[PDB]
């Protein structure tokens, strides 16, 4: 059983905890409680092999930014989340990518760009804007909804695969 160390990062309120909780526990949390740092664990089967997922759910609140360095050293792959109705979160993504790149001293860190809340009408960030960003980083882009489960397994398993195929 291979263990995979996944880390979920991005700005406040984009849906990091909701995505993680949907994946681990199969329900949607509608209340908002800001995270400091939570660790989760699940055994899953991906392409016919049993895997252990260690998932670190991190803080969007800028108050906790000094915790980043440690979790970026230890993490094997990063889910970089923004919300498609939150233009600022899409701008903030770039700062997470650069820190991870700096911390790990590598241009080749396993990562997936996620545009979350795709169930909501009247998006303010265009899919193509995120596609262009992902292309420049050399990483997959996937849209998700923690509320409807759209793309959620795909986003996390794609990240496991990026680590596995590295």
């Amino acid at each position: 059983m291979t263990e995979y160390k996944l880390v979920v990062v991005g700005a406040v309120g984009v849906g990091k905890s909701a995505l993680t909780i949907q994946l681990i526990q199969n329900h949607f949390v509608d209340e908002y409680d800001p995270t400091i740092e939570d660790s989760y664990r699940k055994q899953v089967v991906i392409d016919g092999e049993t895997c252990l997922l260690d998932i670190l759910d991190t803080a969007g609140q800028e108050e906790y930014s000094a915790m980043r360095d440690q979790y970026m050293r230890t993490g094997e792959g990063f889910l970089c989340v923004f919300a498609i109705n939150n233009t600022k979160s899409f701008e903030d993504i770039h700062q997470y990518r650069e820190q991870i790149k700096r911390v790990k001293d590598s241009d080749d860190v396993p990562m997936v760009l996620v545009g979350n809340k795709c169930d909501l009408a009247a998006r303010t960030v265009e899919s193509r804007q995120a596609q262009d960003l992902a292309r420049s980083y050399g990483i997959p882009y996937i849209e998700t909804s923690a509320k409807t489960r759209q793309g959620v397994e795909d986003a996390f398993y794609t990240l496991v695969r990026e680590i596995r195929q590295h």
Partner: protein, 97 residues
Amino acid sequence: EESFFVQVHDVSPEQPRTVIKAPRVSTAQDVIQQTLCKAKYSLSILSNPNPSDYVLLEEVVKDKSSQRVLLDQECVFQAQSKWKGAGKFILKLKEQV
């Protein structure tokens, strides 16, 4: 200066760890209730949601590790401040202890 951060370990099978911001006046029972709220959708927690059924254990490295069960009404911040000692708090059912 009114709050402090505590990491609680072995919380549930699906949620091994959580960090919470607690009032420094918090008892072990107060911190337990905050932790049960954080892990409230874990199946083991839905099954046993009453904080009075739990304890915090502190494990501290010497100057080998020692362990000690906190009293229900003991101040967690006082215990942490006394560590000699790299340390951790562990959530356990009283029946396990």
